[PDB]
């Protein structure tokens, strides 16, 4: 990871349903969204917010260094956001409802001179995981068994 200004991320999540520190009790409120180790804001439903940011990142609106992890213990619930500058990441291909996304019709485009890795991460089919978002994944090994 390279880096990004932190303060722009604070404004972007606050309008998407983040209920800030001015109001929070917090416990036991199904809460505790962190941001680079700092605790800012609270959201109500865990499954709604962690899926919402991932759908926007795989469209192209927000910047490409944002990754959301969820923790789903029987009694504890955290939503982690990471926007620091020194992590180590890894590329995978998004699968969706059983079908591998962006099959051959784009793959001849990589073989030709049309598009490249700069275009695939903007088009939303390649995903860089941390170690922390990779906890939620479940990765296949071959295109045969998907």
């Amino acid at each position: 990871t390279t880096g990004i200004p932190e303060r722009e991320v604070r404004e972007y999540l606050m309008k998407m349903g983040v209920v800030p520190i001015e109001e929070r009790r917090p416990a036991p409120g199904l809460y505790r969204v962190y941001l680079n180790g700092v605790l800012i804001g609270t959201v109500e439903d865990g499954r709604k917010l962690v899926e919402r940011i991932r759908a926007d990142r795989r469209a192209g609106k927000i910047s490409d260094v944002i990754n959301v992890a969820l923790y789903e213990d029987e009694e504890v619930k955290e939503v982690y956001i990471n926007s620091d500058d020194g992590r180590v990441r890894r590329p995978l291909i998004v699968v969706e409802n059983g079908k591998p996304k962006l099959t051959r019709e784009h793959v001849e485009g990589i073989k030709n001179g049309t598009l490249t890795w700069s275009d695939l991460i903007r088009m939303g089919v390649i995903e860089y995981l941390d170690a922390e978002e990779e906890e939620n994944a479940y990765v296949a090994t071959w295109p045969w068994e998907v």
């Binding site: 020194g86 180590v88 941390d130 170690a131």
Partner: peptide, 10 residues
């Protein structure tokens, strides 16, 4: 040891 919390200053 878990690489969620181990960064690289370079």
């Amino acid at each position: 040891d878990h690489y969620a919390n181990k960064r690289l200053k370079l």
